Design a protein around this ligand. Structure first.
Ligand SMILES: CC(C)=CCC/C(C)=C/CC/C(C)=C/CC/C(C)=C\CC/C(C)=C/CC/C(C)=C/CC/C(C)=C/CC/C(C)=C/CC/C(C)=C\CC/C(C)=C/CC[C@@H](C)CCOP(=O)(O)O[C@@H]1O[C@H](CO)[C@@H](O)[C@H](O)[C@@H]1O
Ligand SMILES: Nc1nc2c(ncn2[C@@H]2O[C@H](COP(=O)(O)OP(=O)(O)O)[C@@H](O)[C@H]2O)c(=O)[nH]1
Length: 346
């Protein structure tokens, strides 16, 4: 039995077409429609209860708690199906792909994502710059949350999941996107993605911080924020050991220009040690030597980046200290990422 969770705000002119084509695609099968409307200044909450004659439609309206992810959480609570399908009422999400979503869940996947960006997937009547802010955020997600590194459209509002995935789980009401909360905090072993087409208005830069604020939150939960802190404490530890050996070498008659080289190299080694027994102690794999060599490529990558970022900022007219500092900060940035996805890959 399938519950099709449709959260709404000001959506009257679609419920007809919506329910018609939901029912059309699911003809015969055991399904319901749980609608969660947050007291719409629109007839929606009433028109749905109206349409509950032709179509299997439950309608909960709430007067005290609103928000999309807030709804879907309740949409889970108030459902009664073996499989949840979540989508949007506007019809940007086609009810006809819903049968693919469940079939996929039938053949053993825990979560079936309706995906813009798998082979088969399409986006139309979207401009290039709105099309690629998308792939760019998605790209911040996949890199920053290694759990979902391999998911093409992990920010979809259109997905199906077994009821088990999200039960006994405190999903977060605020979270900007609920499918994300689920991929991070839910219980599962398999995820597929189904190709669909995004069907036939702007959004300020404030929600961009809201999306990023979500990702920072997922990160604290996942422990990455914790790792990054410790990684930084080593980084400082290395910045110290680099200098301490330099002084120790110039004073023993090693010309600074020769001296710097063992200095930096013992500094890369020091860094490797403490990261491999503190920050990424959990996720070590294979040869320690192969991990060591990996770390070197990451150090080097961090340095090449510091350099390039510094000069490009300078040439843009940025103050040398800001430019030097932004150089260091994006250097720890890239060094971490590579270490996280290559040196200690998972
Ligand atoms: C360069 C280096 C990597 C800097 C390090 C970065 C930092 C410092 C890392 C520090 C360590 C930590 C943070 C680890 C994590 C790292 C991570 C966070 C970032 C690292 C990745 C790096 C920085 C990327 C770059 C490194 C570069 C400089 C290198 C030069 C080479 C290359 C060529 C350079 C390219 C430049 C690069 C690619 C820029 C990446 C960002 C761009 C600018 C796009 C930001 C966009 C986001 C933020 C907008 C908000 C999202 C909206 C869009 C929501 C809305 O989403 P949707 O609408 O789609 O969602 C839908 O919603 C609708 C509702 O209608 C539903 O119907 C749908 O189903 C669906 O749900
Ligand atoms: N109940 C409820 N539904 C919402 C809310 N926000 C959006 N919706 C519904 O979500 C679907 C698409 O949401 P949309 O606003 O386009 O995406 P968003 O930008 O991530 O919030 C539509 O069917 C809306 O009716 C909300 O706060 N409460």
């Amino acid at each position: 039995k399938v519950s099709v969770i449709i959260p709404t705000y000001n959506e009257r002119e679609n419920l007809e077409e919506l329910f018609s084509r939901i029912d059309n695609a699911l003809q015969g099968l055991n399904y319901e429609i749980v609608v969660v409307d947050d007291d719409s200044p629109d007839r929606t909450w009433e028109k749905a209860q109206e349409l509950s004659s032709k179509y299997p439609v439950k309608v909960i309206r709430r007067t005290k708690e609103k928000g999309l992810s807030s709804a879907v959480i309740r949409g889970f609570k108030e459902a009664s199906g073996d499989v949840f399908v979540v989508m949007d009422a506007d019809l940007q999400h086609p009810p006809e792909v819903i049968p693919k979503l469940i079939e996929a869940i039938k053949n053993g996947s825990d979560i079936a994502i309706g995906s813009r960006y798998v082979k088969g997937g399409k986006v139309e009547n979207w401009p290039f710059y709105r099309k690629l802010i998308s792939k760019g955020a998605i790209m911040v997600g996949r890199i920053a949350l290694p759990k979902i590194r391999d998911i093409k459209d992990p920010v979809s509002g259109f997905f199906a999941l077994r009821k088990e995935v999200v039960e006994g789980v405190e999903l977060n009401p605020i979270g900007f996107k609920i499918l994300m909360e689920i991929l991070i905090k839910g219980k599962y072993s398999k995820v597929v993605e189904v190709p669909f087409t995004f069907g036939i208005s702007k959004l300020k830069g404030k929600t961009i911080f809201e999306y990023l604020r979500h990702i920072y939150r997922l990160m604290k939960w996942e422990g990455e924020i914790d790792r990054i802190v410790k990684f930084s404490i080593v980084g400082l530890s290395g910045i110290l050991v680099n200098e301490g050996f330099l002084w120790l070498f110039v004073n023993l008659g090693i010309p600074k220009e020769i001296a710097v080289i063992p200095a930096v190299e013992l500094s890369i080694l020091n860094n490797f040690f403490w990261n491999d027994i503190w920050t990424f102690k959990d996720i070590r794999r294979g040869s320690i030597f192969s991990r060591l060599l990996k770390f070197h490529i990451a150090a080097l990558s961090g340095a090449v980046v510091n350099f390039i970022v510094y000069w490009i900022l300078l040439f843009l007219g940025i103050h040398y200290l800001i430019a030097n500092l932004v150089g260091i900060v994006l250097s720890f940035g890239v060094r971490y990422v590579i270490n996280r996805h290559v040196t200690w890959a998972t």
